[model samples]
Target: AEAKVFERCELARTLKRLGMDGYRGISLANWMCLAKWESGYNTRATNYNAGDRSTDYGIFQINSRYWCNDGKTPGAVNACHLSCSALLQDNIADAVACAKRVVRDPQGIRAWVAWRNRCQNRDVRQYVQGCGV
Candidate 1:
């Protein structure tokens, strides 16, 4: 599978198909909302953070500094024990799995700056309003 965009309902279905739909109360709506701000639903998204010399990867933008390992990133802990390229794939299972680990951490989705700044308490009900397939 190549990195690609997903329609709202299709994205929901695919997540469930991959068994990555939701876990620990992280809803499909939450996933979609995070995808909007983090990657615009692009599976191949990447962002290099010069401030921290860390790079964010994939749908959830898991950071190399504290999350997945990208090798070049200094101080990367590789909490997910996954290659950064593992996230760029269209499958998204690995990305979802890694994101679950991040959310399970003490901060939960608060680990994502975008979530804390925007998605949190922001009536993102529209994200999943018509799409539950």
Candidate 2:
């Protein structure tokens, strides 16, 4: 499933531009898997019962509150304004960058460890490890 989405190298190029090249392959694959399971790659996807409109949007369903503001982060916006192209172009890169930042920022490995721990699931771990986190 992910292989299909990632088949487009433009996504890889975008990830690289966002400093996410290190984990491009696996991180994206894993993100796609989760998104596929969560929203079927629907950029305008939503979960009305989730109690928060920003809870999910785009390819990864990134919460708007945490990631919105297009000028600050290209392609960021409300769920209704989301587009599959935007996710392929920016949201995925942003997600990967955010993950990498968490792993490389002040918190360092401890932060990555915590994130990994939170995702005890093997698939999620595979993605993090693939990104060298």
Candidate 3:
């Protein structure tokens, strides 16, 4: 499938750096699908729908509390004015790195599964099948 807004080659490169190349066909596809559902591929995306003035900021709509030391801190003072390092590199390398860290970490994917179970109104089997887990 052709990537309409974002550059596909750059996305692939970023994914490769994230050790996502192995899962490029299925897992990455699922990841992108979810990303689209979450933020529409906008690196600068934010969500005011959360009803909290505190919850607005960057791609993946990352909240301010989890802000990393990686230069562009999301949700800080002048937070919306802060630019992501991911937005700077080719293919969103920094974003991909952050995502990989989340997925491979102890809590992230498991948390995601739990959320999927609750919000998706679907079983783990269905989730796994859809995401190629």
Steric collisions counted per model: 0, 1, 0
By lDDT, who's the top model here?
1
**Candidate 1, which segments miss by more than 4 Å at Cα?**
1-3, 20-22
Tens digits of per-residue lDDT, candidate 2, 7-110, equal: 33444345456665445333544443454455554444543223443343344544444334333233344333442234434246554544453345454323
Best by TM-score: 1
TM-score of each: 0.90, 0.38, 0.49
For model 2, the superposed segments whose C-alpha errors exceed 4 Å read 1-21, 24-26, 53-55, 69-120, 123-133
Q: Cα lDDT of all candidates, in order?
A: 0.81, 0.42, 0.44
Q: Which digits, one per residue and each the tens of the lDDT, describe model 1 over residues 1-133?
A: 3557767777777776766555767777777788889988878889889987899998788899888989888867989989988988878889988988888898788788888788888787788776655
List the lowest-lDDT window of 10 residues for candidate 3: 124-133
* True lDDT of residue 23, candidate 3: 47
Model 2 superposed RMSD (Cα): 8.4
**Ranked candidates, highest lDDT first:** 1, 3, 2
Candidates 1 and 2: which is better by lDDT? Answer: 1
Candidate 3: where is the Cα deviation over 4 Å?
1-4, 7-18, 22-26, 48-59, 69-91, 110-133
